[PDB]
Structure of Protein S100-B:
Amino acid sequence: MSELEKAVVALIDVFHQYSGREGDKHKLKKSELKELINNELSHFLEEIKEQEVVDKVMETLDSDGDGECDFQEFMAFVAMITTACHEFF
Amino acid sequence: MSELEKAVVALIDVFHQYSGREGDKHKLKKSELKELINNELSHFLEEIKEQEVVDKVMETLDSDGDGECDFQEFMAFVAMITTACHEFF
Ligand SMILES: CN(C)CCCN1c2ccccc2Sc2ccc(Cl)cc21
Ligand SMILES: [Ca+2]
Ligand SMILES: [Ca+2]
Ligand SMILES: [Ca+2]
Ligand SMILES: [Ca+2]
């Protein structure tokens, strides 16, 4: 697989690794998002150390008002991050 | 860097290796998009070698009508591919 293909599979791989941990296996609840951020985005984003910060990130990424982050909501997030990274270049 | 961080930077690195070959260094003209797809998406997509197929794909991805694919347009393309792959699993 090419560099691009590996990255696409990796976005899926990571989402599922965290979403699959508790309850709905296709959505990130607040605990799993916190773990994803803390363990997969430790160079790009501040560590979240407080629940009320977690709560605040979730309500942003959660567009459909269900309290959790689904794959399309996670892709929105990844696009936000990649755009900030691209701009930084 | 984590699986996720590597994947973000790969999206950038791939776009810019193809975008910087001709003309605008931050956009993909048709020839650059052609080779990116042909060389970086070969397990996901069929190769494209007829100019009216290239035209049609560019027409699909070009949202601002300048005849090129910029980075936000490439990320839209990536999220598409990523969504289709997630669907399969
Ligand atoms: C382009 N450069 C000079 C920054 C390098 C990339 N880089 C980075 C980039 C943008 C935002 C945050 C970071 S954290 C980081 C931590 C370790 C390493 Cl090894 C690299 C990075
Ligand atoms: Ca879950
Ligand atoms: Ca949601
Ligand atoms: Ca170019
Ligand atoms: Ca365009």
In short: Chain A touches chain B through 33 residues (CB under 8 Å). The radius of gyration of chain A is 13 Å. Residues 18 and 33 of chain A are 7 Å apart (CA to CA). Helices of chain A lie at 3-19, 30-40, 51-61, 71-88.
